[PDB]
From Swiss-Prot, chains A, B:
Complexes and interactors: Homotetramer.
Active site: 69 (proton donor), 145 (nucleophile)
Protein name from the UniProt record: Beta-galactosidase
Residues where Mg(2+) 1 binds: 24, 26, 69
Length: 211, 211
């Protein structure tokens, strides 16, 4: 959840908002080790329920999100249902566990390509065009992360948009991401320079991946 | 409906058959002028019912077809329900009236393209990839006619088969068609040659479109 003033500003200028619970357990092995564990349910619930209680009156918030990159646990299913019950006014989405689990109203893959399948074991990323038409699937598809803009990037961006326009059920996506996460450091003359991971003696690190 | 020996031979050699009733009114304006008219229902029914009564025991017959190119009329709807009622063992298909009407179990267009939309009024031929994921659609798609093999033809044939393999609900189609409809004429010195429309004094004619 963002600084409270952000929602105000989005109400007034006009932007659609995905409001997301503070839940990400990426580094667990496997990814759902905590979110499938009922002993971590109360801790998780407070991060979803308190977001809904604070933010439920802003018109700019149109979709609720259960977090990100935490696999798919039974805690997600319970919390998905909690939201659908106290606030029917907004769809709920969540990406973990293959983008199309029983915990999401919207097929929300990350980095799924337009025409090319990436058939990973257990959690494949199908081409988005193919994904809509998988036997028995009916939901809309909106990428929660796509077109990773790291460095000299964004090649093939046109290809997504040609598809978004041609397919009614392909309803677009959220580019990753807005602003470089670099920090300021100074030399011996007082000149500032932009820094990434590693530049503070911080280790282990992931270098330029923060930009 | 074919020569009765055809079905026996398909049973024994192993071929899937689409048995099709003797109804085509392509030349009416509009195409469904008779098939929507209740006074032509008796003549139509006899052509569907007498087919099902004759061929219903052949295992090679897997699909029933209501005819071809007669637009979409209420008589197609009645006769569709008649078949489903007397023989639940087999799906019923019909291409006329846009290829996805209430008178077909299978989306079965003729000459719809792989990637390219052809948005004709009322009877659009969508790209087969797009057609599957239209809002509310769930049916399998098999082209009743595709890859028109007239003269030096069959360009772009690989593009269909690449799509057939990648998309589960795209399940193939039937090439148009098997054999050239030319006839033998003889000249002054008694040598045979292959003839097409017009070559008999026949007028009006459609020249080589029979090949
Ligand atoms: Na769209
Ligand atoms: Na990053
Ligand atoms: Na297929
Ligand atoms: Na022809």
């Amino acid at each position: 959840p963002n600084h409270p003033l952000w929602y105000t500003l989005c109400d007034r200028y006009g932007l659609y908002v995905v409001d997301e619970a503070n839940i990400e357990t990426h580094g667990m092995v496997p990814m759902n080790r905590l979110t499938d564990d009922p002993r971590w349910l109360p801790a998780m619930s407070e991060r979803v329920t308190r977001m809904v209680q604070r933010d439920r009156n802003h018109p700019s918030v149109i979709i609720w999100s259960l977090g990100t990159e935490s696999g798919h646990g039974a805690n997600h299913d319970a919390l998905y249902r909690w939201i659908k019950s106290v606030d029917p006014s907004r769809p709920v989405q969540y990406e973990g566990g293959g983008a199309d689990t029983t915990a999401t109203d919207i097929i929300c893959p990350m980095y799924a390509r337009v025409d090319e399948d990436q058939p990973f074991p257990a959690v494949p990323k199908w081409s988005i065009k193919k994904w809509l038409s998988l036997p028995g699937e009916t939901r809309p598809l909106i990428l929660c992360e796509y077109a990773h803009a790291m460095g000299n990037s964004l090649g093939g961006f046109a290809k997504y948009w040609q598809a978004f326009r041609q397919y009614p059920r392909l309803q677009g996506g959220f580019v990753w991401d807005w602003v470089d996460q670099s920090l300021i450091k100074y030399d011996e003359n007082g000149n500032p320079w932009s820094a990434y991971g590693g530049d503070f003696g911080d280790t282990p690190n992931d270098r330029q991946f923060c930009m």
